[PDB]
Amino acid sequence: FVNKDQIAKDVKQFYDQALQQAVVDDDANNAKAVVKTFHETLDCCGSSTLTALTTSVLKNNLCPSISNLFKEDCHQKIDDLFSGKH
Amino acid sequence: FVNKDQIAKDVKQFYDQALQQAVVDDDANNAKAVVKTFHETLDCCGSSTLTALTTSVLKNNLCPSNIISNLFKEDCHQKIDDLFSGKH
Amino acid sequence: DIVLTQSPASLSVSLGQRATISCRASKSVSTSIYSYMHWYQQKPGQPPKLLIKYASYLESGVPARFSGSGSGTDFTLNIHPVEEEDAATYYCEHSREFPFTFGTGTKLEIKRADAAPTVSIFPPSSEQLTSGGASVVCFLNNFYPKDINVKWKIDGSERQNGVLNSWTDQDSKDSTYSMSSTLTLTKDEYERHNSYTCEATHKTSTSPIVKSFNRNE
Amino acid sequence: DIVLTQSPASLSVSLGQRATISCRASKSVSTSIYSYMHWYQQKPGQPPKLLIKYASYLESGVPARFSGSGSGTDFTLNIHPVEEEDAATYYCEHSREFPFTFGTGTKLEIKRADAAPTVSIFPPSSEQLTSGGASVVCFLNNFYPKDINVKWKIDGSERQNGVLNSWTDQDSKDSTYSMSSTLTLTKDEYERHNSYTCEATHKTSTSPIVKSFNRNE
Amino acid sequence: QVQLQQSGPELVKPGASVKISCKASGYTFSSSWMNWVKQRPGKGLEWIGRIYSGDGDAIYNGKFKGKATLTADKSSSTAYMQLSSLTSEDSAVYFCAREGKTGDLLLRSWGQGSALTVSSAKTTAPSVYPLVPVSSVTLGCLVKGYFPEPVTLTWNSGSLSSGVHTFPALLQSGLYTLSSSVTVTSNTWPSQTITCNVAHPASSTKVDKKIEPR
Amino acid sequence: QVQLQQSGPELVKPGASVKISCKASGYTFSSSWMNWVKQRPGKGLEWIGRIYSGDGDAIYNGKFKGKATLTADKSSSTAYMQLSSLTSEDSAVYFCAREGKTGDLLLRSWGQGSALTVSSAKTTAPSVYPLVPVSSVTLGCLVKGYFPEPVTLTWNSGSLSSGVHTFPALLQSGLYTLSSSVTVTSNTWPSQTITCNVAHPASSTKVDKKIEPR
């Protein structure tokens, strides 16, 4: 074998859809859980490609414990995981 | 939407490939690095599907601060599931 | 910034008929699972009301005759069957990124059956005279279409002595317009003359509808 | 525990010449990118030696005539051209799980022509006789193939009082085998019969080759 | 019932500041976002920014960054919006709108708006004149010579709403003037009393000119 | 320069224990795995267990979990194996074998092995009998009634090795016996003396026996 790229893209895409569901969908319990799990684990908050919604998710306490959201890009954390820096 | 169980299986697949390559390969330096990254991030050590190779990985200092089994409680396949299922 | 180009700028649609407005974004507004485009309705004098969210979803308590569709940059809104209460300006808005921006705006006009106005003339009140001011007011009310002509006669003779005319927004219950024409002139001149007429000429009228009063009963 | 079943039990090819050994596992000894079945070479007295690792990769300093193929549960070692010093027992072995387990093994012989044995009887030494006991040895040397029969006649009639037989490892130089019958019996019983014989039957021989002696010389 | 009641109209001198206010009810203000949108006469909608009421963190439209200033007040349940260096073309209605319970990014409930008008010109009270007539009956009100906008005309202070036609004001020599028609019947006039209620917040005016025949 | 140096052949009573050894050199023993492999004479190969020398943490085969004990001495660079409640069918050659640096589960380098044998039989020096006959000639030597194994046989102390056939030892009432053939030329026997040299270390026995027809 499996390529590093396509799997790293898939996981971002999986996360991105969680990030959206947690905000736009009302009951989305799992989506919130999934989102917090990622944030807690990878140590990040939201995404550069979803900067507007990330504002919301930060404020819904789904991030670790605003100016510096760009520094906490959670897409980058995913790349670092699969490349082996973290 | 993106297929959940397929992505979780791809990540396990990928981890397994790194874990094996870490020990069997003519020093894949990245494979070893990747394998540490996962263990630290997921609080983790090896696979239950690769328990032979996980042993030697443990002793090569690629696991979080534990000795042998243990190991069966430190399955990464299970932590990968929990990442994609919103637990931990 | 994302630029929302709505079109058409305006349109007129008969009652019971279909109206389709479109909105076009300067770059993509969709992700893998959501189009971040929404439609708003604004009746004049009021705040806008959310009608469609995320391209196609009806905001609760909005008639199903409102529907939306599109993705990426291309978005359409359909009202069918059109009603009187749908007279308003319609706005598309994206929430994909900061800054949020709104569409150029589309004004929906509701074509109904032609209606004859109800003219009514009003001399100055006692109270206005005192201040050396005389205003004659004439209401042309609940008519359609918006095009009306009004003429003033003073003692049989036509005059346009500063007459200011103000039109209403399309009624949201009967889809009619309404117009007040005011003739303002000095207290002096008002009491020089005696007979004051207000003539409304409309599509419905083959000949002018006339209303008047004689100053000094 | 995985079971490794090799085949054939034993093999013999000319200095030419393809030798090809098989191996079967209880379950897949293979992942998405590896297996985990390996091949060892052993010779009498020596420890085993790693030749092919992970199915097909030659271990350093091993001839390119050695080659391995396979996946899942079926694997194959290949020797071509076979050579003198390749004569060994080859064990496959897996490292997929615990415990590791080896194959049943496959012996590699070297095919050659044929040759009758050189038979030679030896009566008990006085040295032996003195202190009880009396053993009559008979060597059957430098022959092929392995299969042969020895028969002991004491005064015509034949009996296996205490016949012990021992074969050599195959010869590296002339590719032949050698055997060793030893008719052991009591000193007293030896001094009763004036005729001892060593009959040796073998392929490429209508009749046996039959060296003999009588205890009176 | 969720409502967002906003500050009254405002006349302010150029180069000054105004602090508009938007009070929220019937929903948890404290953990909600509040947006602000501008609308100039006869023109579209322009988004200013949004503020998180839990800690006053605000994201501004770059165009309003140094001018607009959003603040939240949990105790009141009120969002404020302040604009500095006021200019003729800050004259406009200003709306406030809340997002959903999450950070929906969608303008779910809107206040009535606040008419801010920026001018060095001076207030002027309106003169409210009744208009008695020369089967329904129609009578009218006339509010002449005022500045700035808006006014608030009603009939029997809310009791009459159908048949009412309030016409947009007209500008003439820096003074506004509007009329209103009401048609009742008839049977209800002059039997029941009908009164025109004018209100001009910019001059603290309040008149109840009771129409009657002559 | 890699090498593993196993302990010598060992005889021991049933019920007793043995601690076989293995001395590692020419690689970092302290970071290396060490495996142990049983091979009963005749039969194939069997894996006992393996141990990380760094900490002595070890993994046993189920069949030896309870019987084999593994230990590692970093100051000796010596791996050890310990067998309890010995039995005739623990009589085997036990090997020593190391894995690669990363712990790649591959047996890279082996020791000579260690021939363990469990028996109540008493150690017994052999008897050596010269076997003269009764063109080319063949001579013989008979080593009989010794225990344990092994024994070293040579002709003329190695001087004559070609045209020789020493045969594997066989059991004959709890005692080993083996023979050897040597075929020379005829134009050197009995012209030139020839002697079978038998050595049985267990009884410290060395013996040369000159052949002759007499």
The token pair that represents A41 in the structure block: 């684990």
3-state helix, strand, coil split of chain E in percent (to 5) is 5, 50, 45
Three-state DSSP class for B78?
helix
Q: Which of D80, D91, D100, D114 is nearest to D6 (CA)?
A: D91
In angstroms, this model's resolution equals 2.8
Distances (CA, A) of E211 to A44, B2, C211, E156, F129: 69, 70, 21, 11, 154
Fold of D6-111: Immunoglobulin-like (2.60.40)
E40 touches chain C (CB under 8 A): no
* Distance from C-alpha of D191 to C-alpha of D124, rounded to nearest angstrom: 11
Q: Where are the domains of chain C?
A: 6-111, 112-215
The chain B residue lying nearest D36, using CA atoms, is: B24
The domain F122-214 having CATH identifier 1.20.1340.10: the answer here is: no
Chain-centroid distance of CA F168 in Å reads: 13
For the purposes of burial, counting CB atoms within 10 Å of the CB of C163, is it exposed (0-12), middle (13-18) or buried (19 or more)?
middle
By Cβ distance, the residue of B11, B30, B88 closest to A84 is B30
> A53 and E103: CB-CB below 8 Å?
yes
> F59 and B68: CB-CB below 8 Å?
yes
Which residue type occupies E173?
S
C31 touches chain A (CB under 8 A): yes
By Cβ distance, the residue of B13, B20, B51 closest to D34 is B20
What is the torsional sign of CA C81, C86, C88, C92?
Answer: negative
> A7 and B17: CB-CB below 8 Å?
no
The two domains C6-111 and C112-215 share their CATH topology (first three levels equal): yes
Provide DSSP, chain D: ---EEEE-SEEEE-SSS-EEEEEEESS----SS---EEEEEE-TTSPPEEEEETTTEEPTT--TTEEEEEETTEEEEEESS--GGG-SEEEEEE-SSSSP-B---EEEEE----B--EEEEEPPPHHHHHTS-EEEEEEEEEEBSS--EEEEEESSSB--SSEEE-PPPPPTTT--EEEEEEEEE-HHHHTT-S-EEEEEE-SS-SS-B--EE-S--
* Distance from C-alpha of F49 to C-alpha of B68, rounded to nearest angstrom: 14
* Distance from C-alpha of D123 to C-alpha of F132, rounded to nearest angstrom: 8
Domains of chain B are 1-88 (1.10.1450.10)
* Distance from C-alpha of F45 to C-alpha of A25, rounded to nearest angstrom: 63
By Cβ distance, the residue of D33, D95, D96 closest to B17 is D33
Query: Which residue's structure tokens are 């700028």?
Result: C9
Chains E and A touch (3+ CB pairs under 8 A): yes
* Distance from C-alpha of B1 to C-alpha of F81, rounded to nearest angstrom: 58
Specify whether the CB–CB gap between F181 and F133 falls below 8 A: no
Specify whether the CB–CB gap between F6 and F114 falls below 8 A: yes
Specify the DSSP element, H or E, that contains E153: strand E152-155
* Distance from C-alpha of C169 to C-alpha of E56, rounded to nearest angstrom: 39
Specify whether the CB–CB gap between E144 and E177 falls below 8 A: yes
Q: Which of residues 20-49 of A touch C (CB under 8 A)?
A: 20-21, 24
For the purposes of burial, counting CB atoms within 10 Å of the CB of F120, is it exposed (0-12), middle (13-18) or buried (19 or more)?
exposed
Chains in contact with F, counting 3 or more C-beta pairs less than 8 Å apart as contact = B, D
CA distance C108 to chain A (A): 30
CATH of F1-121, one of 3.20.20.190, 2.60.40.10, 1.10.10.10, 3.40.47.10: 2.60.40.10
By Cβ distance, the residue of A20, A51, A52 closest to C33 is A20
Provide DSSP, chain F: --EEEE---EEE-TT--EEEEEEEESS-GGG-EEEEEEE-SSS--EEEEEEETTT--EEE-TTTBTTEEEEEETTTTEEEEEE-S--GGG-EEEEEEE--TT--S---EE---EEEEE--PPPB--EEEEE------EEEEEEEEEBSS--EEEEGGGTB-TTEEEPPPEESSS-EEEEEEEE--SSSTTTS--EEEEEEGGGTEEEEEE----
Which residue type occupies F201?
P
Q: Which of F40, F39, F82 is nearest to F58 (CA)?
A: F82
Beta bridge partner(s), residue E197: E154, E208
* Distance from C-alpha of D12 to C-alpha of E196, rounded to nearest angstrom: 122
Please enumerate in sequence order all residues whose Cβ is within 8 A of that of F163, keeping only pairs 6 or more positions apart, or say none: F182, F183, F184
Fold of D112-215: Immunoglobulin-like (2.60.40)
Three-state DSSP class for A79?
helix
Q: Where are the domains of chain F?
A: 1-121, 122-214
Beta bridge partner(s), residue F177: F144, F170
Structure-determination technique? X-ray
* Residue of C40, C95, C122 to mutate for E, most E C-beta atoms under 10 A: C122
Specify whether the CB–CB gap between D75 and D91 falls below 8 A: no
The two domains E1-121 and E122-214 share their CATH topology (first three levels equal): yes
